[PDB]
């Protein structure tokens, strides 16, 4: 029951949790969605009927009935959060606000050629939440073209005022555009001593770090594990920051872990989605309900289906003697976390999966199935698609990868002498070519996007996008794959897979059942040595030492997520010599601008 629609001139009476300041009601709704308690909100827009102090007031509310009394008021905009909704959600707001000054701690001031450039700085910076930028037209001269960066405890501005000839906007780290490097490397037996800006109780360091990530002020963190000596401090997740933006010192200690915010790589990593169960762990919180459940799995589904429930502990029928109906405790707290974490009273705890819809769908797990080297099989590579040509007669043309609901990502060289999209057929989730028949269902390609600069495969820009006529219902058979995040350029991928039907040209011949081969990456420079006749750009990556087709995916698995590191472009020829691929990372800005 998503009421996505905002409510004009309406105020929701009472139930306030807190008050923040947002540029729009529309952003208020996002803030409400992402706060652990908020079901609904009331925004106060700029207007005579209200004093300047209360404009941009965004009031986060909760109700046990899940709603509140509506009273009309001028300038009041009110909504419900998206927790209640099936549709995916994003925290990424690209709005520039004209004549708006969003106040905060101003930690840096400089000259910028424009709002956009000011914003790329806000985004590329470790501390930046939102920026304000003074235009030329700005009367006071030495202030002209100053782009000043700010941060707050909450990530939202302490106040908002109208100041003409100025533009404010938010960091785009959550639009997946930041060039800031993510440090995924986690330090066991380590602690950090710097400003502690908040603290939660976490079941492990993974959740700790996830929590660090979506917390606006948290740059790095320390976790005091269950095995920590001081009892009071166990499972305590400490969220830290510093003026440099780095840990002042690495102190050595046992049973504590440290790490960093992943805010940059936010889109390729599970963040709000905690799918593990925690056994003989009980999560202390406020009790919402207690119900009969057959298992901790249905326990969780009850949690997820209960909108106020943030977490649960399931208590199983006792010690295998008892009838198998357990007790499901639906819990909540003030942040979305446990107040206390207790080990050894034999409950099974986890979180609400209602959160997961905030994650990018390319982060969801893939059922284990069977790992057979010889052949691929159902659901194994949900992103890979086969790209078919009608002319002369219908046959496999290329490989492609689903990077979107509406999008395939593939090679440009695949479209050589293709006169229109109208001849293209994209099939999804196909194991066998034999499997395709006249009745087989497929996606029509609405549009082919080839790189402005593309000329030839061995020239660099071999990449293309397909926009589909019709969006994909994701299924264990057909899913997206994540694009490498720019913050990850230094990641070392040790597990990589070329998939496809084996078409690098009509000769060679083709393949029926989808083929899969794990392949080592090879360094550019080492690659440059095997290819003398040709150059190898920073926009190309190699591998080998090759069952894939043209436009086919190079899928690297990192931290339990699949990334599309490269697209098969020209490798001449199975030999030894590695395939040369396009470097997807290097095209991120490009893909994003094209897909939005």
């Amino acid at each position: 029951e998503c009421v996505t629609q905002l409510l004009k001139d309406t105020c929701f009476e009472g139930g306030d949790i807190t008050t923040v300041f947002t540029p729009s009601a529309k952003y208020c709704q996002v803030v409400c969605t992402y706060h652990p308690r908020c079901l609904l909100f009331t925004f106060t827009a700029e207007s005579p009927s209200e004093d300047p102090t209360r404009w941009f007031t965004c009031v986060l509310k909760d109700s046990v009935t899940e709603t509140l009394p509506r009273v009309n008021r001028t300038a009041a905009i009110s909504g419900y959060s998206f927790k209640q909704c099936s549709h995916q959600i994003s925290a990424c707001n690209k709005d520039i606000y004209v004549d708006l000054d969003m106040k905060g701690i101003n930690y840096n001031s400089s000259v910028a050629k424009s709002a956009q450039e000011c914003q790329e700085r806000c985004t590329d910076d470790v501390h930046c939440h939102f920026f304000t930028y003074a235009t030329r037209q700005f009367p006071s001269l030495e202030h002209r073209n100053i782009c000043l960066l700010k941060h707050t405890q909450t990530g939202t501005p302490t106040r908002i005022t109208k100041l003409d000839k100025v533009v404010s906007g938010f960091s785009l780290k959550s639009c997946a555009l930041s060039n800031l490097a993510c440090i995924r490397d986690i330090f066991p037996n380590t602690v950090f001593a710097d400003s502690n800006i908040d603290s939660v109780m976490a079941p492990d360091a993974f959740v700790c770090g996830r929590i660090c990530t979506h917390h606006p002020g948290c740059l790095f963190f320390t976790f005091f594990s269950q095995e920590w000596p001081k009892e009071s401090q166990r499972n305590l997740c400490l969220l830290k920051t510093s003026e440099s933006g780095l840990p002042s010192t690495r102190i050595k200690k046992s049973k504590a872990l440290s790490g960093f915010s992943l805010q940059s790589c936010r889109h390729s990593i599970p963040v709000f989605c905690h799918s593990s169960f925690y056994h003989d762990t009980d999560f202390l919180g406020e009790e919402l309900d207690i119900v009969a459940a057959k298992s901790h799995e249905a326990c969780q589904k009850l949690c997820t289906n209960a909108v106020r429930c943030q977490f649960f502990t399931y208590t199983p029928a006792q010690a295998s003697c008892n009838e198998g109906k357990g007790k499901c405790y639906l819990k909540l707290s003030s942040n979305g976390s446990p107040t206390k974490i207790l080990h050894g009273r034999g409950g099974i705890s986890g979180y609400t999966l209602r959160l997961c819809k905030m994650d990018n769908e390319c982060t969801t797990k893939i059922k284990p199935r069977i790992v057979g080297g010889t052949a691929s099989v159902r659901g194994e590579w949900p992103w890979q698609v086969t790209l078919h040509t009608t002319s002369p007669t219908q046959r496999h043309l290329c490989g492609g990868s689903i990077i979107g609901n509406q999008w395939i990502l593939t090679a440009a060289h695949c479209f050589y002498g293709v006169e229109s999209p109208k001849i293209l057929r994209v099939y999804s989730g196909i194991l066998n070519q034999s499997e395709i028949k006249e009745d087989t269902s497929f996606f029509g390609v609405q549009e082919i996007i080839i790189h402005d600069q593309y000329k030839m495969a061995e020239s660099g820009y071999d990449i293309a996008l397909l926009k589909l006529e019709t969006t994909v219902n994701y299924t264990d058979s057909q899913r997206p794959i994540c694009l490498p995040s720019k913050g990850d350029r230094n990641v070392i991928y040790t597990d990589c897979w070329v998939t496809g039907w084996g078409y690098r040209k009509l000769r060679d011949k083709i393949q029926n059942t989808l083929q899969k081969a794990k392949i080592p990456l090879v360094t550019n420079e080492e690659c440059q040595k095997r290819y003398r006749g040709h150059k190898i750009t920073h926009k190309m990556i190699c591998a080998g030492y090759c069952k894939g087709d043209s436009g086919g995916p190079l899928s690297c698995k990192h931290n339990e997520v699949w990334h599309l590191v490269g697209i098969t472009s020209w490798g001449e020829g199975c030999a030894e010599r590695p395939g040369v691929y396009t470097n997807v990372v290097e095209y991120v800005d490009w893909i994003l601008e094209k897909t939005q």
Partner: peptide, 8 residues
């Protein structure tokens, strides 16, 4: 950090 707010 000294940084000053834009004049009204």
């Amino acid at each position: 950090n000294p940084i000053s707010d834009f004049p009204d």
